[PDB]
Amino acid sequence: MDIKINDITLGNNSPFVLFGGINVLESLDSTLQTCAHYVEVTRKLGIPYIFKASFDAANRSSIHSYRGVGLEEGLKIFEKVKAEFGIPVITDVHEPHQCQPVAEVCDVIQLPAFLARQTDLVVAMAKTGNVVNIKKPQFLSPSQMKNIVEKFHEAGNGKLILCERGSSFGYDNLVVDMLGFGVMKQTCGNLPVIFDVTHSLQTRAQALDLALAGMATRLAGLFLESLHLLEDFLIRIKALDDLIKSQPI
Amino acid sequence: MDIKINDITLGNNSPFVLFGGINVLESLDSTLQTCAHYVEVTRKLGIPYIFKASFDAANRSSIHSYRGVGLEEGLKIFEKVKAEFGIPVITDVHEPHQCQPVAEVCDVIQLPAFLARQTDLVVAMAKTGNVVNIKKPQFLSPSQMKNIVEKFHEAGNGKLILCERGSSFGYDNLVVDMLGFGVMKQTCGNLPVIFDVTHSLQRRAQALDLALAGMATRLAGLFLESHLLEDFLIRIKALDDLIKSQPILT
Amino acid sequence: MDIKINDITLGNNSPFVLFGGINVLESLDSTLQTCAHYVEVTRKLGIPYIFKASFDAANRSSIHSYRGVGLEEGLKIFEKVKAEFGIPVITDVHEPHQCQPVAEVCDVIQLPAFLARQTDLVVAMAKTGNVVNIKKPQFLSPSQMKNIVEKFHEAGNGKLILCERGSSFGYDNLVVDMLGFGVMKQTCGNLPVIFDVTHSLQGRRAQALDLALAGMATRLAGLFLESLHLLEDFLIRIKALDDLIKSQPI
Amino acid sequence: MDIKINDITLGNNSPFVLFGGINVLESLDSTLQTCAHYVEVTRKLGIPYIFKASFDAANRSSIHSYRGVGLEEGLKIFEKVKAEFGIPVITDVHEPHQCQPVAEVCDVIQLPAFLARQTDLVVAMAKTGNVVNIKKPQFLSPSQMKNIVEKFHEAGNGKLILCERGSSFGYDNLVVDMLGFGVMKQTCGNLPVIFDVTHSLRAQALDLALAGMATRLAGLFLESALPLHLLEDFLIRIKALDDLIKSQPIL
Ligand SMILES: [Cl-]
Ligand SMILES: [Cl-]
Ligand SMILES: [Cl-]
Ligand code: NA
């Protein structure tokens, strides 16, 4: 199943889409400058591009840590991003009440990994009718993903992306099971599967090897965070994706 | 470090405390009935007991499964449980705004595993001044519990219980690392550590083996998401009494 | 199923048997000293005891590392240990040809964990008719032990002990699944199950005590352990727990 | 570091080498037939090829299951393969005494994973001077491969291949850590790394093989286990990705 995001076709047998941008929104001008760069690079490489950021640092590690710009100022920055660039955007939500007004602005809304089993947030996300990105928790198997998709379907929204970020492997370590992408396609009705290579690594030659290996299994998209390093990175990812997508299934 | 919960002393060198009750509150009548059974068994054996229930069923497996009575009517039920049995109670909270009103009635407030890194919730829980049960995520290592404890301490609350639930072990399976109890005591100032045996089991023989193994390491309490109860508790009490009666090694 | 090893009765509902000694035999005199210590402590505590050592260093870390005294001198030392102390002994074998000569002298022969699926070694060990200790590989699940047991039975030997040594847990780490003991008992005919606490690991001997107590709480036939009187202090506590567990009806 | 195996160059920056054949040697005519098919297909696509089989199946799922033709007859069969097709061959050794007899006939000798820490066997394999494939145990981390490599070096043999076969992942189940390849390259001096996709496990073998080879590897290790007739379709896709990845500079 493909999904249309404005102009963009996202699917497991389509050219890969890049989801990319900043950990946490800090200021308008800082964001425009990051986004500008991703757009120029993707535009000449001809890679469809969706801008990502959080407006809220929900898991900030110290009670004195930066909070983010908050919802109100974050949606303003997102509104500026879409008007200046004409691209879709994606952000995460952590509370049912945030869902409707986030979804008014942001093309894709994201269910945070920690919160995948929070049923009221699932329902409030489903209700908006928007494309939803479901971040697979490190503690859930690719087979348990259908249970979450079932909830979204029962609540009447089938426009779902599944997003891989690694699996718990002993203490304090992650491994990405390259067979899990296939399992998710097979049990979840060939919904778009994308690969969050950045969070898979947190526990760069390493990021390139991992991104290539995951994209070799034929995926809808790549999901990251951030002289000319991105561009050279994406040239290599595009070369692989083009080849893979050109072979019959 | 011991924690006083009304007339109960909770600590890794005190007689173990049983936490248990019902999954989700629906009615007063139904709650009082379950709680009465726990009370009668634990009283007969002399085991301290804290009644546990959710007012919001936040991770129900179907979206349309009953969501619980909700905050307002839930707290009314908890009030009547406390009045009728004279025991402490515990419930989980989900948003910052819930913490104060819940803490007015519930002696222990519980931080759900999936919220354990939500800084706003941790702060609002800390500010109640109540005893807090921290449920350990199955993907978090025992040494990472320190970081959560730290956040609570920064926000002014040291009355913390750590609740073991098992660890991710390949796909689907959980294993309980019996060494992780000691790592938590050692790294987290010997806060009371309790063992949620049920979650780890996703059969009576299995629950018994696992509960006995954990209690053998010397723990403040046993946490169920559960004369069947009585027979099980007779065995746990036997082990706990033996272990606790002996001094920690020289 | 219980096993007689000379005068010792090994079984999951019998008093636990301690297995211990040294890693690699170095000389007759230091062997006899180490054994005397274990014998002194276990006799005074009333615990049956089987001495263990390797005559071999098959996995020695450097090609220049110490080899051990080897089979011929190894077997001589085991003869002397047995004549001096009148206790059974246990050693590992890594090659099929080693099995019959080693079994001449050693009461129990041990299938190293790395080799537990090596069909020729299984067969050669089985043919000796001796008591065999099967080390569960860290990479095998408890439900797979039935397959190795089945092979030993096809090769004609049912005097089998199963030995837990932990399971792979990410890179460079082991966890012991306390539910595995019960799975082995249930699927392998209640053969004696023993717990290699020493290999399951890797303040600190705090750790070995915690692990040993947690494992013995599940009701096991025996324990593998290595040594002012730490061994004594550990065993007093393990024996108290074992006596309680074994006095409860299953 | 590259290794020459007769006229084949094996290396992490060279066209991938296929190590393929069967599990256990069973009979002469069947072996030759299966080898013929591998040879035909790899020759057709220009893929360097090394025939693999065991003469001693040491971990059979039942004790009286056929162990294989044994050393003497197994080496005769390998001789016939090399004579008929003119390709290199690879087999596993199980005891020190086997190492010399096997190495005089076989181009690559393999250290089974379950024996990987047996020092006596490592020493005797090292002393042949033969190219050695080291099979990484599923319970061993990538950074611990350097300890095995060091024992081989100490005994005088540096012609070593590292073979990935997956890592234990909970019970009864394997995951391949795609970052494990780079760790082995970095810590073991960029010795050739190959990927045993068969023992790491359909559509799956292909996904897994393509992911592995995307990280830039010296070879692919499989048993036909694949259906033998779909071999060409499988290899066309591997070769396409390998040719892409190898054609770009590193970094
Ligand atoms: Cl996660
Ligand atoms: Cl092992
Ligand atoms: Cl292995
Ligand atoms: Na208060």
The domain segmentation of chain B, as residue ranges, is 1-250
Residue C24, class by beta-carbon neighbours within 10 Å (0-12 exposed, 13-18 middle, 19+ buried)?
Answer: middle
Chain D contact for C117 (CB, 8 A cutoff): yes
Q: B92 alpha carbon to ligand 4 midpoint, in Å?
A: 16
Chain A contact for B174 (CB, 8 A cutoff): no
Q: By three-state DSSP, how is residue B70 classified?
A: coil
Both tokens of residue C22?
């040294």
Q: What is the dihedral of CA B198, C138, C170, A194, to 10 degrees?
A: -80
Sign of CA dihedral C92, C98, C102, C108: positive
Instruction: Choose among A129, A26, A31: nearest CA to A79.
Output: A31
How many angstroms separate the CA atoms of C81 and B215, rounded?
38
D114, D144, D155 member nearest C115 (Cβ): D114
Judging contacts by C-beta atoms under 8 Å, the chain D residues touching residue C137 are 139
Instruction: Choose among A1, A7, A77: nearest CA to A43.
Output: A7
Touching partners of D (3+ C-beta pairs < 8 Å): A, B, C
Judging contacts by C-beta atoms under 8 Å, the chain C residues touching residue D137 are 139
* Interruption sites in chain D after residues (C→N beyond 2.5 Å): 201, 224
How many angstroms separate the CA atoms of D63 and D56, rounded?
13
Please name the fold of domain A1-249: TIM Barrel (3.20.20)
C181, C203, C211 member nearest B178 (Cβ): C211
Both tokens of residue C69?
């005294």
Q: By three-state DSSP, how is residue D29 classified?
A: helix
C58, C120, C172 member nearest D118 (Cβ): C58
Please identify every residue whose CB atom is under 5 Å from ligand 3, which is an ion.
D 113, 137-138
D58, D142, D144 member nearest C118 (Cβ): D58
* AA letter at C93: V
> Is C59 in contact with D118 (CB distance < 8 Å)?
yes
H runs (alpha helix) in chain D: 28-45, 71-85, 99-105, 119-128, 145-154, 180-187, 203-214, 231-246
Min Cα–Cα distance to chain D from A184, Å: 13
Q: C217 alpha carbon to ligand 2 midpoint, in Å?
A: 24
Judging contacts by C-beta atoms under 8 Å, the chain A residues touching residue C173 are 170-171
Give, as one character, the DSSP assignment of residue B120.
H
Q: How was this structure determined?
A: X-ray
* AA letter at D51: F
**What is the chain D residue with the closest CA to A247?**
D237
> Is A148 in contact with A119 (CB distance < 8 Å)?
no
CB proximity list for A63: less than 8 A, separation 6 or greater: B119, B122, B123, B151, B154, B155
Touching partners of A (3+ C-beta pairs < 8 Å): B, C, D
Q: What is the dihedral of CA D174, D179, D184, D187, to 10 degrees?
A: -140
> Is D92 in contact with D112 (CB distance < 8 Å)?
yes
Q: By three-state DSSP, how is residue A51 classified?
A: strand
- Judged by CB atoms closer than 8 Å, whether chains meet at D115 and C120 is answered as no
Give the closest ligand to the alpha carbon of residue D113.
3
- Residue ranges with strand state E in A88-206: 89-92, 108-111, 131-135, 160-164, 167-168, 174-175, 193-196
- Judged by CB atoms closer than 8 Å, whether chains meet at A62 and B154 is answered as yes
**What is the chain C residue with the closest CA to B200?**
C179
Q: D58 alpha carbon to ligand 3 midpoint, in Å?
A: 13
Instruction: Choose among A194, A107, A202: nearest CA to A145.
Output: A194
Chain B contact for A183 (CB, 8 A cutoff): no
> Do strands C89-92 and C108-111 pair parallel, antiparallel, or not at all (unpaired)?
parallel
Query: D1-251 maps to which CATH number?
Result: 3.20.20.70
Q: Which whole-number Å values give the CA distances from D63 to C108, C149, D192, in the listed order?
A: 22, 12, 35
How many angstroms separate the CA atoms of C101 and C71, rounded?
9
Judging contacts by C-beta atoms under 8 Å, the chain D residues touching residue C57 are 119
- Judged by CB atoms closer than 8 Å, whether chains meet at A213 and D208 is answered as no
Instruction: Choose among D239, D199, D200: nearest CA to D219.
Output: D239
How many angstroms separate the CA atoms of B187 and B183, rounded?
6
H runs (alpha helix) in chain B: 28-45, 71-85, 96-103, 119-126, 145-154, 179-187, 197-200, 204-215, 228-245
- Judged by CB atoms closer than 8 Å, whether chains meet at A212 and D245 is answered as yes
Q: D112 alpha carbon to ligand 3 midpoint, in Å?
A: 8
Both tokens of residue D145?
């491969």
Instruction: Choose among B90, B136, B97: nearest CA to B117.
Output: B136
Helices then strands, counting H and E runs in chain A, come out as 9, 12
B167, B178, B238 member nearest C214 (Cβ): B178
Neighbours of C198 (CB within 10 A): 18
The CA R_g of chain A, rounded to the nearest whole Å, is 17
CB proximity list for A237: less than 8 A, separation 6 or greater: A16, A211, A212, A215, A222
Please name the fold of domain B1-250: TIM Barrel (3.20.20)
For residue D196, give the H/E element and its range: strand D193-196
H runs (alpha helix) in B86-227: 96-103, 119-126, 145-154, 179-187, 197-200, 204-215
* AA letter at A70: G
- Judged by CB atoms closer than 8 Å, whether chains meet at B171 and A167 is answered as yes
CB proximity list for A38: less than 8 A, separation 6 or greater: A18, A20, A21, A49, A51, A226, A230
For residue C162, give the H/E element and its range: strand C160-164
Give the closest ligand to the alpha carbon of residue D138.
3
- Judged by CB atoms closer than 8 Å, whether chains meet at A179 and D248 is answered as no
Q: By three-state DSSP, how is residue A16 classified?
A: coil
Give the closest ligand to the alpha carbon of residue C111.
2
Largest CA distance in chain A: 53
Judging contacts by C-beta atoms under 8 Å, the chain B residues touching residue C172 are none
Both tokens of residue A238?
């595009």
Give the closest ligand to the alpha carbon of residue D114.
3
How many angstroms separate the CA atoms of A10 and C209, rounded?
56
Both tokens of residue C115?
């080799």
